[model samples]
Target: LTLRIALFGAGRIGHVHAANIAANPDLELVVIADPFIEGAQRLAEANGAEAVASPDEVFARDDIDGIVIGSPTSTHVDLITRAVERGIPALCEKPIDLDIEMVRACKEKIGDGASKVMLGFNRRFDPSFAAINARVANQEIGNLEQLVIISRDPAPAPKDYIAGSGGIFRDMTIHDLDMARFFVPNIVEVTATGANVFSQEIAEFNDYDQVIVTLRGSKGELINIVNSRHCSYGYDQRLEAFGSKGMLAADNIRPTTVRKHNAESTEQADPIFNFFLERYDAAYKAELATFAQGIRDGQGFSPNFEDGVIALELANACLESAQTGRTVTLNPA
Candidate 1:
């Protein structure tokens, strides 16, 4: 049976989810809910879904078996709590809310059965990253001692976006923070430093285009994250997990594995995928597949609500540490 899914938000990510839903065999895109009805209609028209200006209309429908929350950061808490309250399994985009307090309150209201709401940390579904995590857990590289994640976009967003973005820690680095948690769940301390070098727009908004963060886990495992809003190369995303035995690294992926050698360039190929969507396309598909399967099998979702909260808490810690130049401790020494 095809699971009827209603989507909230018709923005960039909303469009991505709509397409993914359309591609999945067991899932159907029934309706798109966005207060901005124009965007909703645009996405719905492309995907053969009904369009609505209000979420209530989506909730009022009896046919919706699942929900995908791709709305703005401010709308996530409300949409998520309502969906879970009504027993609709939802997959929500990250940074539950710009305000951590609201996310915590949502957590309090939902109480338990939070698995009905899956947090969208799509990088976890990346095959390369997943394989490294599995081997690390299998003790293939011995006990995990260190994790290093580097994420950089090809360019920064507009000034308007930066103003509403809750700074770089939440807007950009949050993804890396979640990836960090994917490997080391119990982060104890956070120390971060930010710099604005390239973008005057970001600097004027008092946001950093570059940042470095270090976190310590409960068992003394260390994780370091490096982030930048602008990169000369295409999206610079790579990971290295190291222990006593060996090290595993997931390098940036290009459109093809073919490399050319000539007098001018040595072992160079086409540029890496320039945008996030192109870069993590497979990860997003796998993420939706996992969400649909979990709904069908009645198994709980991985990277659930608590995972979202912890990632936000770590982002907040990074913000605090970057501003104050101190190491913020999570669990007591």
Candidate 2:
């Protein structure tokens, strides 16, 4: 059955989803919605879809079966809330919101039982990462002890984006924070530290472009998350899981060139990977495709309401930890 998919937000990530939708065989890119008509129209024109002025138009349509939200970070809570209320199947990007209460309220509106809302944790879908998960499940890493995740962008975004970004722990390190939750056994608490090292522009606002977080899982697994807005060597992302008997790691995606000069061998600096959107191409595709498969199978897909709630809670705790300089426990509120 062909699924009619509506897209909200026509920003950088929105275009990626739009292309993915157009490429999927069982899904039709129905409409593109954006406050900026040109942004929507530009993408729609390439994909043979209509550009709508408001998300309401797309959400209200019976023909639009699902939604792929790619709007600004600030709009995530409201857009997801509206989609769930309208009974539209949706895939919302990570950290549903920096505001824990807002995320809970949105999830509340999504209702109980099988959730129609799918949180976008694209890293879980990447082939290499999936393989790593499979290995962990198969005990290739024995009994897990600790998980280390490294995520660094080759460069930081503009100061304005950083300022409105809900801070590094929420905006940047949150991915790795969620990664720890995704791979580790159980998470109990989070301790974090942030510093401004990349640029004075980001520093001026008390926003640190570099940050580190330690997540204590319920099972006593220690997870380390490291982040930097600027890496002189492009987008650097990798993860490692250490178990009682062994260890496994996902390597950075980089150029395969090697060379020797002056009687010494030197490996060319791996071309900077830019950003997650470009680096995790297959992961993004799998995220949407998996949502389609779940609809086809009539099975409730996970990263559901509860997952969103927990993730948002973790993100909030991390941000709070960074701010207060204390280890924040995941309290039952």
Candidate 3:
């Protein structure tokens, strides 16, 4: 059965999902919605889909099987609430909203099990990360003890974008926080430190360009996250899992997987992927497939709304810890 999907937001990530949707044989891109009519129309027409002036038009249609929300963070919570209330399954990009209270309230208001709202925590679906999970499952890493995640962007976001971003913790490090939860459940403590080495604009907003967050799980499984908004070489993304039996790591991906060896010294490989879009191409495709499969099974998606909330809670905790210079204890909600 072909699933007809309406895509919201005509920006970069929207096109990423659109391409993935067009690539999937079981999925059909039906309508694209965005306030930017020209961009929406252009993207929609390219994929044999129609463009609508607003999301409401897509919501009003009975032909749409599912919705993909790639809109700005400010619009996410309301749109997600509306989609769920309308009995439409949706895949919403991160945070849910900048405000923690707003997300909590939205989840409370929706209180329905029928709505399938998948949070776009796409990193968990990345092939390398998934391999680590599989190895842990197979006892390749016996009784996981600690996890280390490294995330650094090739460059900072535009100043205008950072101005409204809900600080670095929510906007940047939230992905790492979610990935931490993916591997180590019951994280009860979070301690964070922040720095403004680069981007004075970020500091002006009282946000940091670099941060280190340490999380301790109930079982004493530790997770350390290192994040930076700028990496001169490339987008640096790597993870290591240490356990009783052995250690497993997912190294950064190069442009090509080949390495060169020379007489003087081993020549280095291509720099790591320049940006997230390049690094996570396969994962985004898998994420779309997972959302589509959840729609098919009528069994809701993993990394659902609650997962989003928990990740946001963690982000908030990191913010609080950074500001207070103290470890914060989190009580599961």
Candidate 4:
């Protein structure tokens, strides 16, 4: 009863998911695919999976049970459509397509049975963040009133990657936007601001290194997110949920819990896990587990295709608001 998997892309993220899939007893990484044969071969050899040069080869294999699209953003829609057409489920990374219309078109192709498509918003699986969500649903925090998410990358991406990254709102803040929706599903309005205090190349690309967005949910819950492409301290990720009765907050995670106190000052804990690979390692593993179980049990995956679209919609709204310096109201779905 093993789920034979084909992983597309053997890059950083692909490597991460490959490791997760290999570690799972019920998941069999049958083959790894990437244009970069060396990368594909390396990851495949490390995980006891075969290496393939093209996704088409994986798609043609009748033995494969599922697909994991960790490839580039441009290839997602077509790959997802192909996977669905072949009756294979997939766990695809975020920004289904850079173009919103393309995402809508892809959705139409998949139609109502879109639960097989799991959007990679891994924060939803983070132990701490998931705990907050569970408690909020249990009303531990009372009626949810506000959400605050802070995300900062350790550094900026390469110039070419940034050029095609669909700007800051879509590329960086989209994850936080999805997190906001996880807590407040009825987000109705958005306002945002962007600045390029650092990274001149980002400015040239017309994207900001820093961004702040505010969202209003249907029930009048407020959500605020602060994002940055540069976090000198480390990969900064935090969240807070406030309700009528009390509040819950998840702070940055450190490598260790120990703290040193000295006469001069209290030396803080080790820098927050340097980057997402370390920060959300558990979340990545859990997400793959959820993906495998959902595919096997027919329970369906959370953060489905629609979740991807809605998050992208919110990100687009934020980009618009930031560019126009106005508040945008979303029509109810």
Candidate 5:
């Protein structure tokens, strides 16, 4: 089935999703919307899609079957609400909103019946990571006890982004947090510690370039995540989950082979695949394919709007923990 896809936001992530939509034989990129008229115009022209001045324009359009939202983080709640109201299937990027009240209100608005909403938690779709998940599900690893996620980038972004970034928790560590929720049966509490080591400028902005957090799960399990704004090596991400019987791990994405002997060794992959684009490339396509499949198969999507709302709540709790030097329980209600 051909899916008519309208992509909102012409920013970096938006462009990537647009390309993914265009490449999918089953999906059509019909529109590109953004408040920045220039970006919307250029992106639409480049991709043979219509340009819209706002998300509302796309939401109101009749031809668009589903929408992919990659707009500014702050605009997520409004755009998602609008899409849900239109009864259009939607895929929204992480952290629906950093504000707790807005997230709660949006959840009530969704009211548990929107089958078309899919949150973009691309890590769940990564082949390497998925293998580990399969093992855990298959009981290759016994009752899962603990999961660890290690994510770091080689460098930080422009200082300007830090101001609007919603800190390391909302912007960066949120992925790992969501992944923890994905692997665990329940999330009970969050504890975090972070530092600003890369630059004084980032420190001045009340943002940390490095952080480590622990999440206590209600099923008597634990998840640990450590992240940094700089890795000195590339995008460095890997995961290992320990179960009662064995361990499951998704090895780092790198070259297939390393050559060395005589007490020497070399692991030949670029750190963290340099950026999320390369690291999550397959995951992105798989995500779209999964969403498209869900649309066709009539099975409801997992990690929908509620997942985004809960993820934001967890992120906010982590930040509060970091700020208060105390563990925080994440309760959306």
Candidate 6:
């Protein structure tokens, strides 16, 4: 039998999950949960699922096997715990919450049963990124020395979004931080700085439009995360891993690999994918599949509740270091 999934949220990300769930053989989109009935009904109708005005209804249903929480950051904790307490596995979007203690509290509530929760750090499932990680683990790169991550968005998010987004480190660079941890098992220090080069709205929120972070691993591996809110060419996402023996890089993705050579320019490629969804489409699908399969096979999730907590810890450290101009030390123990 397919996993009966109740999807929370009917926003952009919710629609993305709905489509991915509909495409997968092992998952069923049983219902769409959202207070905004208009969007919920629209998304549900397209996916052949029912729409409900609240998650309360879904939690009571015995047929519901799993949950996909695409709701706002504030609702993530409660929804995850509710699903956990009901013995239902949940795959939730990231950050967990804006506040660390709140997230920690959620952990206390769920306790060891947190195995049912999977944090949506979907970049780990990106084929190219995952390949490099596999190679690193296989020692194709000898001992890992340095990891470089580049993430730049097309432009700044709306002021309203930035206001509630928990700043760039938590909102955007958290993914990069998680990716860095994916390469380096243990990070001992975080040095970061944020600048408001552009976007007065970002400045208003005391958030940086540009950021740079340095992480030191227990093995002395150096990880640098560079970020920007605006990229002229396209959405720039690249990862490079340098080790004692070699290096592996995952460059930007384009609509086509066709390179153009002209009298004026050489090796010019198409613009990189402009949106996160388009760029990481395959990763999202793979992540969902992994979640369903992991459940059916009695295997637990990677990037579990603990992973989310660690990422948030790193993000908070970045914010503290950036705001205070001091390197924050973390106890790897």
Specify the highest-lDDT model's number: 6
Report the C-alpha lDDT of model 4 over 124-169, residue by residue, as the tens digit.
9999999999999999979999899999999999988998999999
- lDDT, candidate 6, 1-333, per-residue tens: 888999999999999999999999998998999999999999999999999998888886899888999989989999999999988999999978989999989999889879998999999999999999999999998999999999999999887788899999999999999998888869999999899897888888878999999999998999999999999989999999999999999988999989999999999999899999999999999999999987797578987888899999999999999989999998744
Candidate 2, 286-322: lDDT as tens digits: 9999989876765676666567667666777877888
Worst 10 residues of 1 by lDDT: 106-115
Error of 4 at 237 (Å): 0.4
State how far residue 240 of model 1 sits from its true place (Å).
0.5
Ten residues in sequence with the least summed lDDT for candidate 5 = 263-272
After superposition, candidate 3 runs with Cα above 4 Å error: 113-115, 260-265
What lDDT, from 0 to 1, does candidate 4 have?
Answer: 0.91
Task: Report the Cα lDDT for residue 235, model 1.
Answer: 95
* Cα-based lDDT at residue 257, candidate 4: 91
TM-score of 4: 0.97
How many pairs of residues in model 2 come into backbone collision?
Answer: 6
Which residue pairs show collisions in model 5?
235-272, 236-272
lDDT of 5: 0.82
TM-score of each: 0.97, 0.93, 0.97, 0.97, 0.91, 0.97
In the range 1-333, model 3's lDDT, one tens digit per residue, is 899998999999999999999999989999999999999999999999999888778887888788899989988988888888878899999978889888878888888842589999999999999889888979996999999999998888898898898888999899999999889868999999999896878878888999999999999999999999999889999999999999999988887878888886696688788978889999999999999999999887888887898898999999999999999999846
Query: How many residue pairs clash in model 6?
Result: 0
Pairs clashing within candidate 1: none
RMSD of every candidate to native, in Å, equals: 1.3, 2.1, 1.6, 1.3, 2.6, 1.3
- Give the alpha-carbon lDDT of every model: 0.91, 0.80, 0.90, 0.91, 0.82, 0.92
